[PDB]
Amino acid sequence: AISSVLNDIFSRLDPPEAEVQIDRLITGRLQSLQTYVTQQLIRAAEIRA
Amino acid sequence: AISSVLNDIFSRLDPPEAEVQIDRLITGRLQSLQTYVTQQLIRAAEIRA
Amino acid sequence: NATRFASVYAWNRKRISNCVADYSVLYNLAPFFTFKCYGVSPTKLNDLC
Amino acid sequence: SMTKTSVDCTMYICGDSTECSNLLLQYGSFCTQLKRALTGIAVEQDKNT
Amino acid sequence: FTNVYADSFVIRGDEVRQIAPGQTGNIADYNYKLPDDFTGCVIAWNSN
């Protein structure tokens, strides 16, 4: 995205133009959660072993 | 994307249009890299037991 | 509003700072042939800094 | 034990162009922690033997 | 589709490009707006 702050996206772009840049930023933040929880489940399989 | 070669995107398409097509190829290689690390951590857990 | 301008090889580059302006007479009121914007929302020009 | 592997972030994600490495600063640490996760496999393969 | 609303208005050629989703201006703000989810066509013809 052009900015990492959601107040600096929707206020600095059009509401048709903000729906591209916000949906790229949430999908990048969903993939950061998919790396975190998958790492915790593999370490849960090690710590229960 | 149209072409998988990054040299074919920059030498043909416009620089506003190149940043869409290159970033589709970067995101698809990171999802294949996220596929490879997730499998090799589980195969490390199967070889640990 | 000036009658005489400069050309594309050497233009008149003016610096405007430390004041307040009104973009409602430039944008909202529009006796202009073409107004275009790229990275900034044209509606929010009176808002942003 | 298994076969210890390592993945370079530069050669796999990019096609050895200068425009691809400038776009990885916005993506950041995606390939850094996936490199360190394969480092964490490879230090445990020597401990199994 | 369910129904059509034909909005007939005579507009000058300088202001005719402000009929679109997401427009702001003299004719755009205080008279006729379109939302971002609006779906339809714009048909123009020279009446001069």
From Swiss-Prot, chain E:
It comes from the Viruses. Residues 12-14 are annotated as: Integrin-binding motif. Binds to host ACE2. RBD also interacts with the N-linked glycan on 'Asn-90' of ACE2. Cleavage of S generates a polybasic C-terminal sequence on S1 that binds to host Neuropilin-1 (NRP1) and Neuropilin-2 (NRP2) receptors. Interacts with host integrin alpha-5/beta-1 (ITGA5:ITGB1) and with ACE2 in complex with integrin alpha-5/beta-1 (ITGA5:ITGB1). May interact via cytoplasmic c-terminus with M protein. May interact (via N-terminus) with host bilirubin and biliverdin, thereby preventing antibody binding to the SARS-CoV-2 spike NTD via an allosteric mechanism. Attaches the virion to the cell membrane by interacting with host receptor, initiating the infection. The major receptor is host ACE2. When S2/S2' has been cleaved, binding to the receptor triggers direct fusion at the cell membrane. When S2/S2' has not been cleaved, binding to the receptor results in internalization of the virus by endocytosis using host TFRC and GRM2 and leading to fusion of the virion membrane with the host endosomal membrane. Alternatively, may use NRP1/NRP2 and integrin as entry receptors. This is Spike protein S1. It comes from Severe acute respiratory syndrome coronavirus 2 (2019-nCoV). The lineage of its organism: Viruses, Riboviria, Orthornavirae, Pisuviricota, Pisoniviricetes.
